[PDB]
Write an enzyme that holds these catalytic residues in place. Structure first.
Site, PDB file in Angstrom:
ATOM      1  N   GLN A  92       0.819  -1.203   0.000  1.00 27.90           N
ATOM      2  CA  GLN A  92       0.000   0.000   0.000  1.00 27.90           C
ATOM      3  C   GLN A  92       0.858   1.261   0.000  1.00 27.90           C
ATOM      4  O   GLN A  92       1.897   1.302   0.649  1.00 27.90           O
ATOM      5  CB  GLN A  92      -0.874   0.047   1.220  1.00 27.90           C
ATOM      6  CG  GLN A  92      -1.962  -0.978   1.272  1.00 27.90           C
ATOM      7  CD  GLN A  92      -2.589  -1.017   2.662  1.00 27.90           C
ATOM      8  OE1 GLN A  92      -3.506  -1.782   2.933  1.00 27.90           O
ATOM      9  NE2 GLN A  92      -2.081  -0.190   3.548  1.00 27.90           N
ATOM     10  N   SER A 146      -4.740  -0.389   7.274  1.00 26.94           N
ATOM     11  CA  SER A 146      -4.573  -1.599   8.058  1.00 26.94           C
ATOM     12  C   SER A 146      -4.443  -1.228   9.477  1.00 26.94           C
ATOM     13  O   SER A 146      -5.036  -1.850  10.347  1.00 26.94           O
ATOM     14  CB  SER A 146      -3.331  -2.344   7.626  1.00 26.94           C
ATOM     15  OG  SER A 146      -3.329  -2.430   6.212  1.00 26.94           O
ATOM     16  N   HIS A 158       1.733   1.790  11.526  1.00 31.48           N
ATOM     17  CA  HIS A 158       3.028   1.115  11.438  1.00 31.48           C
ATOM     18  C   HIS A 158       4.211   1.933  11.977  1.00 31.48           C
ATOM     19  O   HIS A 158       4.214   3.185  11.959  1.00 31.48           O
ATOM     20  CB  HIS A 158       3.390   0.838   9.998  1.00 31.48           C
ATOM     21  CG  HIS A 158       2.287   0.245   9.184  1.00 31.48           C
ATOM     22  ND1 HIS A 158       2.359  -1.029   8.670  1.00 31.48           N
ATOM     23  CD2 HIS A 158       1.112   0.763   8.750  1.00 31.48           C
ATOM     24  CE1 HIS A 158       1.273  -1.275   7.954  1.00 31.48           C
ATOM     25  NE2 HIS A 158       0.505  -0.199   7.980  1.00 31.48           N
TER      26      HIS A 158
HETATM   27  O1  LIG Z   1      -3.358  -7.140   8.382  1.00 30.25           O
HETATM   28  C1  LIG Z   1      -2.193  -7.533   8.281  1.00 30.25           C
HETATM   29  O2  LIG Z   1      -1.901  -8.666   8.675  1.00 30.25           O
HETATM   30  C2  LIG Z   1      -1.115  -6.635   7.661  1.00 30.25           C
HETATM   31  C3  LIG Z   1      -1.276  -5.750   6.670  1.00 30.25           C
HETATM   32  C4  LIG Z   1      -0.047  -5.251   6.493  1.00 30.25           C
HETATM   33  C5  LIG Z   1       0.361  -4.263   5.606  1.00 30.25           C
HETATM   34  C6  LIG Z   1       1.680  -4.248   5.164  1.00 30.25           C
HETATM   35  C7  LIG Z   1       2.106  -3.254   4.305  1.00 30.25           C
HETATM   36  C8  LIG Z   1       1.194  -2.291   3.905  1.00 30.25           C
HETATM   37  C9  LIG Z   1      -0.113  -2.349   4.379  1.00 30.25           C
HETATM   38  N1  LIG Z   1      -0.503  -3.304   5.215  1.00 30.25           N
HETATM   39  N2  LIG Z   1       0.779  -5.830   7.369  1.00 30.25           N
HETATM   40  N3  LIG Z   1       0.156  -6.651   8.054  1.00 30.25           N
END
Ligand SMILES: O=C(O)c1cc(-c2ccccn2)n[nH]1
Length: 145
Positions: A113, A136, A139
């Site tokens: 994303q 999501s 981060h």
């Molecule tokens: O829901 C999950 O398990 C999840 C989604 C992501 C993710 C990783 C990169 C970009 C966006 N989302 N990383 N983990």
């Protein structure tokens, strides 16, 4: 100054610092393209998250404001050497990549994303990001290669 590194004014000391509006990193010292980059991350999901579910908790209930708090919390522990990314990531990350100390493996554009990408590419080998918001959750992105 490199991608999105802007200078600014600290509202506590009035002394210089830099924030990056692409990775939300903020540091005091002045800052310092790859086809692929390798990243680890620590994800803290919230109610508005895509799939409010994770190996840690079956239905995530924490708000967004609270997700951020938690995320800020680890940044402080990481930045202060009290904890390292891997430890907090292997415990708290709501992604299953936590089992892998938060590694997401090498990768290039189009692949993840966009806000995660834009941060992931704008960091240099070693930089952690600040809080990064995607559909999501929130981060902390460390870039490894
Ligand atoms: O829901 C999950 O398990 C999840 C989604 C992501 C993710 C990783 C990169 C970009 C966006 N989302 N990383 N983990």
């Amino acid at each position: 100054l490199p991608p999105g590194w802007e200078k600014a004014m600290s509202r506590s000391s009035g002394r210089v610092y830099y924030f990056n509006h692409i990775t939300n990193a903020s540091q005091w010292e002045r800052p310092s393209e790859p086809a692929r980059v390798r990243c680890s991350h620590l994800l803290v999901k919230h109610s508005q998250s895509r799939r409010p579910s994770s190996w840690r908790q079956e239905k995530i209930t924490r708000t967004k404001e609270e997700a951020l708090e938690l995320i800020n919390g680890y940044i402080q522990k990481i930045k202060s050497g009290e904890e390292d990314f891997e430890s907090l990531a292997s415990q708290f990350s709501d992604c299953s990549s936590a089992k892998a100390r938060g590694d997401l493996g090498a990768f290039s554009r189009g692949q993840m994303q966009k806000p995660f990408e834009d941060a992931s590419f704008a960091l240099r080998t070693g930089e952690m990001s600040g809080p990064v918001f995607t559909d999501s959750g929130i981060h902390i992105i460390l870039r490894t290669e």
